[PDB]
Amino acid sequence: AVDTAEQVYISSLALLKMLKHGRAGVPMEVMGLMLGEFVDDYTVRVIDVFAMPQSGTGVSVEAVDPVFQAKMLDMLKQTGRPEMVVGWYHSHPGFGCWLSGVDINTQQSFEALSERAVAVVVDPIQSVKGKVVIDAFRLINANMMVLGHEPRQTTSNLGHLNKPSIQALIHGLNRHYYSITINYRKNELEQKMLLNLHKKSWMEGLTLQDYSEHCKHNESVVKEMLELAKNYNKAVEEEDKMTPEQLAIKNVGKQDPKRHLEEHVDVLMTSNIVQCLAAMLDTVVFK
Amino acid sequence: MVLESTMVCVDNSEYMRNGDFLPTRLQAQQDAVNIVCHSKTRSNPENNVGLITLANDCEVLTTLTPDTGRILSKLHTVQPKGKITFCTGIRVAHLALKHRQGKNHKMRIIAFVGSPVEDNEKDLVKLAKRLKKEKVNVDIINFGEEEVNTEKLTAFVNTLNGKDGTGSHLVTVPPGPSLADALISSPILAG
Amino acid sequence: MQNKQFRNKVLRVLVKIYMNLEKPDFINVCQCLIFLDDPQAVSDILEKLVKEDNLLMAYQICFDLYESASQQFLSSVIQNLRTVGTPEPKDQTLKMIKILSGEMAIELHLQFLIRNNNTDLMILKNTKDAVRNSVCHTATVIANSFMHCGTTSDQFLRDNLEWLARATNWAKFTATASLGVIHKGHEKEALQLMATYLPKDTSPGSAYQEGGGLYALGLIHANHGGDIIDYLLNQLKNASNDIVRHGGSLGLGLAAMGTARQDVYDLLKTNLYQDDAVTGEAAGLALGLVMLGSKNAQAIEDMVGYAQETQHEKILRGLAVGIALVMYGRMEEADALIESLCRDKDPILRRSGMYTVAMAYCGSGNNKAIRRLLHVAVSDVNDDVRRAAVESLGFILFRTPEQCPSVVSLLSESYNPHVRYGAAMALGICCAGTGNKEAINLLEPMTNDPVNYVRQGALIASALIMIQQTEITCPKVNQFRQLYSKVINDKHDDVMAKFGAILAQGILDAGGHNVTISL
Amino acid sequence: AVQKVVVHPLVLLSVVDHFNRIGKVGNQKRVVGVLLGSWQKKVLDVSNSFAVPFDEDDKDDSVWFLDHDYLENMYGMFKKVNARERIVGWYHTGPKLHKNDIAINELMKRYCPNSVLVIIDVKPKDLGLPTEAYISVEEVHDDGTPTSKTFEHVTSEIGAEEAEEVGVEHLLRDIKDTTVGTLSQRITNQVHGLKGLNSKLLDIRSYLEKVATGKLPINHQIIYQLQDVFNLLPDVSLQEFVKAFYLKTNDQMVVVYLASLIRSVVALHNLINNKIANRDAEKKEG
Numbered sequence A: 001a002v003d004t005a006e007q008v009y010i011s012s013l014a015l016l017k018m019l020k021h022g023r024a025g026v027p028m029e030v031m032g033l034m035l036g037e038f039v040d041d042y043t044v045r046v047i048d049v050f051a052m053p054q055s056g057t058g059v060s061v062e063a064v065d066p067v068f069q070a071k072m073l074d075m076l077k078q079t080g081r082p083e084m085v086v087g088w089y090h091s092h093p094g095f096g097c098w099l100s101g102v103d104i105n106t107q108q109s110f111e112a113l114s115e116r117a118v119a120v121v122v123d124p125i126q127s128v129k130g131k132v133v134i135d136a137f138r139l140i141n142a143n144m145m146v147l148g149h150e151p152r153q154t155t156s157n158l159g160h161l162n163k164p165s166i167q168a169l170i171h172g173l174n175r176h177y178y179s180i181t182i183n184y185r186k187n188e189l190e191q192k193m194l195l196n197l198h199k200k201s202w203m204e205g206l207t208l209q210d211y212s213e214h215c216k217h218n219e220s221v222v223k224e225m226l227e228l229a230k231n232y233n234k235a236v237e238e239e240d241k242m243t244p245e246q247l248a249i250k251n252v253g254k255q256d257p258k259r260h261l262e263e264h265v266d267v268l269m270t271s272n273i274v275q276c277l278a279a280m281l282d283t284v285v286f287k
Numbered sequence B: 001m002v003l004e005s006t007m008v009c010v011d012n013s014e015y016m017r018n019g020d021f022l023p024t025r026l027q028a029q030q031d032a033v034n035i036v037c038h039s040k041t042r043s044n045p046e047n048n049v050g051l052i053t054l055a056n057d058c059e060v061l062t063t064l065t066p067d068t069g070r071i072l073s074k075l076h077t078v079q080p081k082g083k084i085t086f087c088t089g090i091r092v093a094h095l096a097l098k099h100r101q102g103k104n105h106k107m108r109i110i111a112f113v114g115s116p117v118e119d120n121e122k123d124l125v126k127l128a129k130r131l132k133k134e135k136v137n138v139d140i141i142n143f144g145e146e147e148v149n150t151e152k153l154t155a156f157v158n159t160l161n162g163k164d165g166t167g168s169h170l171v172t173v174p175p176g177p178s179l180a181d182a183l184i185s186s187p188i189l190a191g
Numbered sequence C: 001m002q003n004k005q006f007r008n009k010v011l012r013v014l015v016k017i018y019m020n021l022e023k024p025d026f027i028n029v030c031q032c033l034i035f036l037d038d039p040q041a042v043s044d045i046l047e048k049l050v051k052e053d054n055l056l057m058a059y060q061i062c063f064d065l066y067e068s069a070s071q072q073f074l075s076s077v078i079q080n081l082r083t084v085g086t087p088e089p090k091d092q093t094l095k096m097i098k099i100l101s102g103e104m105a106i107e108l109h110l111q112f113l114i115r116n117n118n119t120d121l122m123i124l125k126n127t128k129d130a131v132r133n134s135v136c137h138t139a140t141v142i143a144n145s146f147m148h149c150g151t152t153s154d155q156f157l158r159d160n161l162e163w164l165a166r167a168t169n170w171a172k173f174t175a176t177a178s179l180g181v182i183h184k185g186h187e188k189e190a191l192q193l194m195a196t197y198l199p200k201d202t203s204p205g206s207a208y209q210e211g212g213g214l215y216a217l218g219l220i221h222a223n224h225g226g227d228i229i230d231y232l233l234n235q236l237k238n239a240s241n242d243i244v245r246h247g248g249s250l251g252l253g254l255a256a257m258g259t260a261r262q263d264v265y266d267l268l269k270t271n272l273y274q275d276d277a278v279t280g281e282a283a284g285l286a287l288g289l290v291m292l293g294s295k296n297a298q299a300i301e302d303m304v305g306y307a308q309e310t311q312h313e314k315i316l317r318g319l320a321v322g323i324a325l326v327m328y329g330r331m332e333e334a335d336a337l338i339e340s341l342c343r344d345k346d347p348i349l350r351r352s353g354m355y356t357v358a359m360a361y362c363g364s365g366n367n368k369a370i371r372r373l374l375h376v377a378v379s380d381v382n383d384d385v386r387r388a389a390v391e392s393l394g395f396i397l398f399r400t401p402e403q404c405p406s407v408v409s410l411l412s413e414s415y416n417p418h419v420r421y422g423a424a425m426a427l428g429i430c431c432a433g434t435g436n437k438e439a440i441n442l443l444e445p446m447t448n449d450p451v452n453y454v455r456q457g458a459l460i461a462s463a464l465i466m467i468q469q470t471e472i473t474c475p476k477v478n479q480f481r482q483l484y485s486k487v488i489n490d491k492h493d494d495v496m497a498k499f500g501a502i503l504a505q506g507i508l509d510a511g512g513h514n515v516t517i518s519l
Numbered sequence D: 001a002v003q004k005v006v007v008h009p010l011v012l013l014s015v016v017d018h019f020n021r022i023g024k025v026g027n028q029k030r031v032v033g034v035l036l037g038s039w040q041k042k043v044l045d046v047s048n049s050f051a052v053p054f055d056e057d058d059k060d061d062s063v064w065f066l067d068h069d070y071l072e073n074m075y076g077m078f079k080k081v082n083a084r085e086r087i088v089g090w091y092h093t094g095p096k097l098h099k100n101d102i103a104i105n106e107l108m109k110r111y112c113p114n115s116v117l118v119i120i121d122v123k124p125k126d127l128g129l130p131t132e133a134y135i136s137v138e139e140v141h142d143d144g145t146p147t148s149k150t151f152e153h154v155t156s157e158i159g160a161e162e163a164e165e166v167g168v169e170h171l172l173r174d175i176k177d178t179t180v181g182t183l184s185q186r187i188t189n190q191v192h193g194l195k196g197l198n199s200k201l202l203d204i205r206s207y208l209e210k211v212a213t214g215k216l217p218i219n220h221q222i223i224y225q226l227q228d229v230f231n232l233l234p235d236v237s238l239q240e241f242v243k244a245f246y247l248k249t250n251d252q253m254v255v256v257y258l259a260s261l262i263r264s265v266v267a268l269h270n271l272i273n274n275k276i277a278n279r280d281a282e283k284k285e286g
Ligand SMILES: [Zn+2]
Pocket: A095
């Protein structure tokens, strides 16, 4: 009878494998297996994550082929992957990320070997592309109903765990069903390689190709955006001619939610491209 | 039982179809590979057997695996091109011994030489010094010949064969119309 | 805002004028010896005490110089005065013995603090009414340890045993350590009191009693001259599971603070060589405590070399505070160290640079570090250095309490709640012990927000200012009522909001209004 | 045949995994990975990939170790779980193009279709685009050299379809989007000179070195087109482009009128509220 403060380490490997697995996450029930290494009691690290072939039965203990699982794990052991399995993941599209009776039964059957049994459910179908915040699931002991539910120390991270604060699943099904916090980790190779790779993904090949395209399109295509921009500017000034009457009568309170200022500032920002690229044309013409 | 890896190298030159010797002995030595792989299978089915040639462009025909069902099919389409290649023929397997699954399996590589050697004595003492350095069991099997049987290969084996106690043996087959299976099965390496 | 380049010379040249007068003054020699800390400035005043043959005047300077202003300079001046004298002979012996004793202060403090206690049943009854078995169990025992500190009042915990050992978890460790906070300064009743609990088989089923006995023993023998460290090595040598290492490492390092002994360095290194994060964190705290002023050459490079070669975070925070507390008086030395280690890829070590430079620039002697402190507090995207950055700002700007709210008032209501929480700690530490209302009038917007972080830090910051203050001077009814309504309103609040609420209420009732804090 | 290709960062982060699971052995050679993609459509799209045990020799370069059973098993299981992606080629992490790559790529030329080759750097110090698509096609040479494998550079782009942009943006939380305006433009206008300076300056040194100290003909025929394109701009006197400078400068005048006039419109609320608010707050403060 002892419990500690565990935290699931999530790198970019399992994240991207859950993003591609989420793209291939058909409404049919899918299967997955997570790997890693156990260094101590209250920490867990995942490194290897792969997918499993779909079946008509779906998420079940019968669909897990022991000769296929042990075969692929042996093929990973003969290679440079000396990590044991740490859990299994899946997707719950539509009906919510909660776990049914079959999922908790195969979880109870699959947790006999690993005491942790990390469970992660990705659902990018109804999740907006703004946030990709994911949550990890855990299994509580049925004999702990008499004592405290979760005697876990370090209650500070619960504020970070309160971000998924849906009012139906967390305390709608919190009985015998809790969760755990999730953190990330990034070394210098992922920071410089992935940062420079993303900056290059938003940059050009030689970085000097598409500059003259806009520098010379300022005289052909942008002129239409400047004339239309002046058409919207006049379309606002026609009301700005009527503004000094009300502003000259009431001067108390604001009724129009439009600011009429930041939009013109943005128009000036779009207009400053000519000024910023004029020096570019000066450098291309000069040398 | 015995935990060791088996690597065989067969010659694909046109010197293996002469009418003076056996009638296309390629099938005879193929049956030799069959009886040594089935013999090692009867002794210990956990042994892996690889297949590769000694041509100019060496190609891994079959990865080290105990399942000979597909190896029997891979024994065909020998692609009889090239004459002989020794340096990358040794380096293509003796350096690839680290890719085996079971690390407890000993290192054992055999080779069927059907063409005269083109390398000088310097390559023989350098490659022999490397093989003796890494301590890999090397069995030399020479099928067919044009010049004298053993002139420099004697010193090649004596300088290559280390650990005289129960070490490696040399297989020298004389000319004759009889089959080579019973002649190469005489030493302790077969069985 | 001196740079110490000329202040020490002006002081060491101005301390030659009062000795030539008709009588020497103490305010100048004290106010100078608290800053210069030079051995050549004390050798004369320690030997003139025998020539003057005046016993009453030496007791004050011995009391305050042996009291504070130096730890290693006291560790050297105790043998400097020990060498002088016999290896009025009959009076100088008892003088030199009784001046460096230091236990008389513990006797008088234990005396008036043992006869000035005042307890009320409403507070403890309210804690028993609002106690939970999950989170605030440690808050109740730490508040009871705060209110019963120094008075050794264990009769409150002698009522029943089913309220402390009801759950086998860290709550018993915090209860035993809290008991170590209750009683302090005992050479016999401490070890005897810990041994009398179960002197039957010498095998407790819960090792938290032994770990809390070693950690509590380290809390009792902190900065004492009668340390039992010699027995703590023979007791720490035994192999045990995460209680002799953690509790024994914390207690041993706290008891050996300032000794700079190489023995605790060696056994501490071989205790952290197991790659464990808990004994490496406690070993980091103990190493930081014992290395106060040592500044070993290979220790910093060995710890920073040990930092990036491991994946755990408790080892990085333990070695972070370990290399943070070791930096003291290195104003002219830690420039390239903090400037070089500031651009590290690890956010934990990035916080370790700010916590390390915090205590190094005490006294508001450097206005350049704040450029990168606030520059990394606002510019960096990770909230770790953002909420852990302003603690250095308060540690360097703790001198003026009025100038702090003018620059942290913007951080009171920041963008993210992390800077609001760390800024709440900044207002808690910068105005502690003072009576400035520039933060009190700003505490009202801090205590009302849907985020529990700014509410907890607001209750702690208000609890650090409401202490040692009378009601007739300032109308504290607002924060007293809104802070007292948290324990009755805990049913509709978060689980941690009541934890920080009663934990904040335990600060005012600490010691029964007798003991306070001072920076 | 193929004009452009699409390479997702998932394979390069799989190379980051290749550099992660080394284990500090001290080899860090050119680990060859089996590149996967969709060869059906004209454009190439890499989704994911895997690895294969590849080891070479120290002295002899012609040594190469591949595996057919592991490739057919990973391709069989991966095709069973996802049949929309098949084998296309391979890729090596070595920064230098060795001669053995014709024998390494020749296997996937015989068994597999035309394989694409990608050269990257082991250290993320190269500022340029790390991915270069090199098609394995035989081209006829004019000088009369025998027909051999030629690696023609195919342009490449780094883009994500649906989710990898969200994952990368969430993991970074430091990079910025397009954000047209002042900073995103002026940063490019400041650092672009170094973006071309390090590449061109880094190339002209080995170029001028191999001009005089070079042997083993490197197809000098393309150098005539090199210096020819370099001489396609023979320092024009800018005489005819003066009117174009009058047009661009006239657009500059338009931007001046828009800035002065629009900012003059913005000054209304500020230069009015500053008075009516201060005088009323002052006259009504006490
Ligand atoms: Zn379903």
